[PDB]
């Protein structure tokens, strides 16, 4: 009975499309036509962090806005102090192909994972002064792609087996499973309230998930290729995505549509990472052509460029007080940028 | 300076174990192994000797090699392959006996022309020669109806047939080899090459072959730096 169900799916999709098109009375770029442009954004490098021997592949800031963690493919996880450039910690991993790391919002734990299908959790308090493995989560059936702490006892992971999972660290068992994507899941973003989270997959689609219920509420389409990055707008009512089709897009939750597109004719490379600024006015993106671009998010106009890396730019981040930007790339260096 | 001169001193003890660890890792060469189900990859692994990856180690003339194998992954390779862009070499095992040679060739082409894999070399093991030698002598001409141009092919001059070996198996072997060399010598750059070998089922000399191919790879890279090649 495939024909009837396919026809019903087509009819439901048509109804959804009509109900969406009935709402788009105006466009964002028309309502923001009497707004002064931001101008020209010049930013300069203040620090350069050295010590890794292979490509750096992920980073993450702490909530005190001074310490950060980074992961490399030589099997090392380094914890850095950014005001001084002193190395606070260096942890040797059991496996070389790490692809993600996270730093607890309390400052006591770290986590990592990769091509070994495991999530490893390390305790930093270390009464005896030695960092040792505290936990290993061993349930996914494909490589680990991302992970983010909710608190000291719960964690959310996405895997390259088209699934997401919510884990309880204390007993080491899964608590919730989120299924419904049909391709590898690449990124996830926690909301400011952490009652919801968004996810993007290698099927040109994003979804919104409820943590407590375990169900999918909304699906967002509009890109043309695999989605590599995703993040929330500062107030949790919108988010932004970047794909292999060399375009960024802004999606809205309450209107359930797309609002703005960021692209140019001279850009023919994919996008690796995205982030917002503290006020939400600028959007920063990293590319495969070794550079980073700063966009005016309210008007879809380029406002600046950062160019300091000799290889592919793999990660990007902004602090909670908004005073610095950190970029890492495949040339084994981390750079901190600030505005004069 | 009680707060300082102790965090500055601790950061210097960490930085010497980082340099000491990287010293042992500069004498080791890492390989990536690819095959399929029909290809005798397991026998090759055993002769050289539910997790994501397996590792094996061997040592030749006081040099160390690490070889990595992919375990519990899904069918789609286009994302986790990018992790292997700085290995010394890729070993490709092909069962030379559904048209499976066509899809093996397609995978070879996708690997060859991919960005972030354009500077890595390939060692090709054409496995299961006795099966071909038995099959082509019993009137099973799958090459003739899966590859029409085999009707218009003759043995090359640089062929070195083994003694007591029929011409027909020789033509089959060199046709299948030239199929890969046509892709290899088409869209290169001068920055990576291909090293083909004929392998039996269970053999005892593949270790020397890996040793020699890696040595030639590094010598050619160096000679390209000095503008002498």
């Amino acid at each position, epitope marked *: 009975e495939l024909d009837q169900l396919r026809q019903e799916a087509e009819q439901l999709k048509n109804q959804i499309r009509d109900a969406r098109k009935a709402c788009a009375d105006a466009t964002l770029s028309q309502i923001t036509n009497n707004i002064d442009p931001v101008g020209r954004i010049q930013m300069r490098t203040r620090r350069t962090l050295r010590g890794h021997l292979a490509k750096i592949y992920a980073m993450h800031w702490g909530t005190d806005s001074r310490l950060l963690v980074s992961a490399s493919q030589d099997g090392k996880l380094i914890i850095w102090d950014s005001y001084t450039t002193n190395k606070v910690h260096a942890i040797p991993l059991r496996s070389s192909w790490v692809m993600t790391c996270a730093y607890a919002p309390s400052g006591n734990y770290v986590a990592c994972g990769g091509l070994d299908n495991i999530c490893s959790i390390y305790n930093l308090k270390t009464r005896e002064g030695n960092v040792r493995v505290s936990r290993e989560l061993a349930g996914h059936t494909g490589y680990l792609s991302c992970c983010r702490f909710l608190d000291d006892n719960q964690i959310v992971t996405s895997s390259g087996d088209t699934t997401c999972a919510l884990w309880d660290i204390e007993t080491g068992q899964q608590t919730t499973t989120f299924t419904g994507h*049909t391709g590898d899941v690449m990124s996830l973003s926690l909301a400011p309230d952490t009652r919801l989270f968004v996810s993007g997959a290698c099927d040109a689609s994003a979804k919104l998930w409820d943590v407590r219920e375990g169900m999918c509420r909304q699906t967002f389409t509009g890109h043309e*290729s695999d989605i590599n990055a995703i993040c929330f707008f500062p107030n949790g009512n919108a988010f932004a995505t970047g794909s292999d*089709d060399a375009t960024c897009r802004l999606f809205d939750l309450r209107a359930d549509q797309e609002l703005m597109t960021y692209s140019h004719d001279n850009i*023919i490379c994919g996008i690796t990472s995205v982030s917002f600024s503290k006020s939400g006015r600028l959007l920063l993106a990293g590319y495969d052509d070794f550079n980073c671009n700063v966009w005016d998010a309210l008007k879809a106009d380029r406002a600046g460029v950062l160019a300091g890396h000799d290889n592919r730019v793999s990660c990007l981040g902004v602090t909670d007080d908004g005073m610095a930007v950190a970029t890492g790339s495949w040339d084994s260096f981390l750079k901190i940028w600030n505005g004069s | 300076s009680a707060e300082d001169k102790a965090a500055v001193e601790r950061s210097k003890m960490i930085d010497r174990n980082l340099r000491e660890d990287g010293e042992k890792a500069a004498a080791t060469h890492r390989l990536l192994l690819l095959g399929a189900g029909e290809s005798g990859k397991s026998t090759i692994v055993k002769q050289m000797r539910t997790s994501g990856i397996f590792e094996t180690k061997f040592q030749v003339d006081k040099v160390n090699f690490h070889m990595f194998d992919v375990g519990a992954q899904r069918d789609e*390779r286009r994302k986790w392959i990018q992790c292997f862009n700085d290995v010394t070499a890729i070993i490709f095992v092909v069962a030379s006996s559904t048209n499976r040679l066509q899809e093996a060739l*397609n995978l070879f082409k996708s690997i060859w022309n991919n960005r972030w894999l354009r500077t890595i070399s390939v060692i090709l093991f054409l496995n299961k020669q006795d099966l071909l030698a038995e099959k082509v002598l019993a009137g099973k001409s799958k090459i003739e109806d899966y590859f*029409p141009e085999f009707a218009r092919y003759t043995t090359p001059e640089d062929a070195t047939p083994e003694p007591g070996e029929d011409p027909r198996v020789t033509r089959a072997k060199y046709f299948i080899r030239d199929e890969f060399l046509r892709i290899s010598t088409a869209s290169g750059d001068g920055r990576h090459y291909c090293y083909p070998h004929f392998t039996c089922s269970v053999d005892t000399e593949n270790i020397r072959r890996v040793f020699n191919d890696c040595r030639d790879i590094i010598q050619r890279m160096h000679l390209r730096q000095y503008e002498l090649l």
Partner: nanobody
Amino acid sequence: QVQLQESGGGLVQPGGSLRLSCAASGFTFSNYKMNWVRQAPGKGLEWVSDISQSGASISYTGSVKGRFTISRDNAKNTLYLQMNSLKPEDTAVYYCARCPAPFTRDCFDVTSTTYAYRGQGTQVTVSS
């Protein structure tokens, strides 16, 4: 919303001919590379042919070479396969597939594991 819909197919006799069409929507058609794959009863997926962005490079598999002809129309966003002198071994479902990324010279698009950018397919039966 990437969409691809196939048309054609049906039941024919040995020595016959057919013309399969593939209409695409949801992307910039001329930036990508296209190809034709097929699946026979009791087997896996097999790659049949491919054509590039402009149409100056065309590739066929060994068994169908000389009998099939692929073409593309960039103004109307259409892909065509013209099949001549059919045989009973050509009874299968046929799919129209797209490569993952634009401006790119390689593709990984034959997997059974629900490749996302191909269509539902059309059936071709050859019998007396």
